[PDB]
Amino acid sequence: MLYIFDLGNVIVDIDFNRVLGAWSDLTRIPLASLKKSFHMGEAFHQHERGEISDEAFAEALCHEMALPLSYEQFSHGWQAVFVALRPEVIAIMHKLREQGHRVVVLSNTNRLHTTFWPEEYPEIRDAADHIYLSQDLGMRKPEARIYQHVLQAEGFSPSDTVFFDDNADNIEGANQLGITSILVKDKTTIPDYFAKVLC
Amino acid sequence: MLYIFDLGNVIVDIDFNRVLGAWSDLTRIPLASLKKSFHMGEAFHQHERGEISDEAFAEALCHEMALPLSYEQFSHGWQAVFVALRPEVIAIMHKLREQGHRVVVLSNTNRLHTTFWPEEYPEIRDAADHIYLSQDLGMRKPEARIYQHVLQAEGFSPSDTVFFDDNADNIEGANQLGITSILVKDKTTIPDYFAKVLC
Numbered sequence: 001m002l003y004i005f006d007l008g009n010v011i012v013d014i015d016f017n018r019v020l021g022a023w024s025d026l027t028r029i030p031l032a033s034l035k036k037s038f039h040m041g042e043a044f045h046q047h048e049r050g051e052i053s054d055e056a057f058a059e060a061l062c063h064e065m066a067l068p069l070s071y072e073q074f075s076h077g078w079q080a081v082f083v084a085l086r087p088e089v090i091a092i093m094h095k096l097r098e099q100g101h102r103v104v105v106l107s108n109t110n111r112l113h114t115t116f117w118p119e120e121y122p123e124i125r126d127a128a129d130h131i132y133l134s135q136d137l138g139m140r141k142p143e144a145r146i147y148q149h150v151l152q153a154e155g156f157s158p159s160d161t162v163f164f165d166d167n168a169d170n171i172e173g174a175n176q177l178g179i180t181s182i183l184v185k186d187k188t189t190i191p192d193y194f195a196k197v198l199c
Numbered sequence: 200m201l202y203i204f205d206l207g208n209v210i211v212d213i214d215f216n217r218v219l220g221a222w223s224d225l226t227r228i229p230l231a232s233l234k235k236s237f238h239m240g241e242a243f244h245q246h247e248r249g250e251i252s253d254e255a256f257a258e259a260l261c262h263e264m265a266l267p268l269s270y271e272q273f274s275h276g277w278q279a280v281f282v283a284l285r286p287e288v289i290a291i292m293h294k295l296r297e298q299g300h301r302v303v304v305l306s307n308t309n310r311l312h313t314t315f316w317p318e319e320y321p322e323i324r325d326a327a328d329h330i331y332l333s334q335d336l337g338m339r340k341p342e343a344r345i346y347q348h349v350l351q352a353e354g355f356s357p358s359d360t361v362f363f364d365d366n367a368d369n370i371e372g373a374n375q376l377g378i379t380s381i382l383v384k385d386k387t388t389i390p391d392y393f394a395k396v397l398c
C-alpha cells in the first residue's frame with residue numbers, strides 16, 4: 001500500500017501561538033492583538049507554493065499584524081514554533097515500511113530559508129520513504145494536482161492509497177480522486193487504525 | 200507551606216538537542232560533532248549568574264564548538280529549544296496556591312535578552328506566586344546563597360519548605376540547609392507526592 005501522512009497535527013503537534021508569544025516578547029504588542037490579527041490567507045498559500053519569497057511573506061504578515069520587525073526578527077520568532085514528535089506515529093511509519101508498504105509525508109510548509117523546520121528533523125526524514133513539500137512542488141493541499149503528483153511519482157492508484165490528515169478540506173481534495181482518506185480527529189485515530197493490523 | 204519548583208524537567212520538558220539541530224541546519228556541521236562539543240562549564244555558570252553578557256556567553260560556546268555564527272544566528276538557534284508544559288504540574292501549582300500555600304519557581308536561566316524563554320511564558324508566570332531567576336540574583340543552584348535568598352525573601356523556615364528538582368546536586372544543596380528536597384525522577388514524582396493530599 002501507499003501511506004501518505006500529513007505532518008502538522010498528525011506526525012507532530014505544532015503550535016504557532018508560541019511564535020505569537022515570541023513576537024509579543026520582542027515587540028511588547030499584547031498577545032491578544034496578535035492572536036486576532038493572525039490568519040492564514042493568500043500570502044500563506046503563495047508562500048506555501050513557493051510563489052513569493054520568505055521576505056515577501058514576512059512583509060505581508062508584518063503588514064497585516066502591524067509587526068515592526070526586521071526579516072531577521074520575524075524569522076527569529078518564527079523559529080520558536082512549538083513542535084513535538086508523536087513517537088507512536090513515527091514507530092507505525094517505520095513498521096509499515098519494513099512490511100514493504102510505501103510511506104511518505106505530504107506537507108504544506110512555511111519553512112523559511114533561515115529556519116529549522118520539522119521536515120528537516122532527522123527522525124521524520126528517517127521515518128519516511130519520501131517527503132513531499134508544497135514549496136518544492138509549487139502546489140499545496142488540498143489542490144488535486146498535489147495528490148496527483150504523489151500518486152504519479154510513487155506509482156500507485158487511488159485505490160491502493162491511504163491518506164491521513166486533520167484538515168477536512170485536505171481530506172475532501174483527496175477523496176475527489178478516490179484516495180482512501182482518514183480524518184485525524186486526535187492522537188488515537190492513527191494508533192487505532194493500525195492497532196490490529198500491526199500489534 | 201512554601202513550595203519551590205525547578206523549571207527545567209519539572210514544570211516543563213526542555214531539550215537543547217533541538218538547538219543543536221538548528222545550528223547544524225544553518226552551519227551544516229554534523230549534529231554529532233555539536234553533541235560532543237556541547238557541555239555546561241564555567242561560561243554557563245557565569246551566564247546563569249549574570250556575570251557575563253549574552254554576547255560573551257555566545258562567544259564562549261561558539262569558540263568551544265567551532266560555530267561560525269553571528270550573535271544573531273546564535274540567538275536564532277537558541278530560540279529553537281524544545282519546551283513543553285507539564286499541565287499536571289501547572290494545575291497542582293494553581294491548586295496549592297488557592298489552598299493558601301506559597302508557590303514559587305527557582306531557575307538557573309540562560310535566557311538571552313533576544314529570546315522568549317519559559318520563565319516569560321504567561322502560563323508559568325500565572326501559576327506561581329514568584330519566579331526566582333539566577334541572572335537577576337547573581338546566584339545559581341546549587342549554591343546555598345540562592346536557597347537562602349528564597350527562604351529569606353518569602354519568610355519561611357527550611358522545615359516549612361518543600362523543593363522539587365531533578366538535579367541531584369541541587370537537591371543536596373537544599374538538604375544542607377534543612378529544606379525538604381524531593382528529587383524529580385520523572386513525570387510521576389510530583390503527581391504522586393500530591394495525589395492523596397489534593398485529589
Ligand SMILES: [Ca+2]
Pocket residue numbers: 112113114115116117120224225
Ligand atoms: Ca533549514
Ligand SMILES: [Ca+2]
Pocket residue numbers: 025026311312313314315316319
Ligand atoms: Ca524575552
Ligand SMILES: [Cl-]
Pocket residue numbers: 006007008106107108109
Ligand atoms: Cl504540515
Ligand SMILES: [Cl-]
Pocket residue numbers: 028
Ligand atoms: Cl511592556
Ligand SMILES: [Cl-]
Pocket residue numbers: 006007008106107108109141
Ligand atoms: Cl500541511
Ligand SMILES: [Cl-]
Pocket residue numbers: 143144145146
Ligand atoms: Cl489542481
Ligand SMILES: [Cl-]
Pocket residue numbers: 205206207305306307308
Ligand atoms: Cl530551569
Ligand SMILES: [Cl-]
Pocket residue numbers: 227
Ligand atoms: Cl551539507
Ligand SMILES: [Cl-]
Pocket residue numbers: 205206207305306307308340
Ligand atoms: Cl535550573
Ligand SMILES: [Cl-]
Pocket residue numbers: 342343344345
Ligand atoms: Cl553560597
Ligand SMILES: [Mg+2]
Pocket residue numbers: 006007008009010165166167
Ligand atoms: Mg495537519
Ligand SMILES: [Mg+2]
Pocket residue numbers: 205206207208209364365366
Ligand atoms: Mg531541572
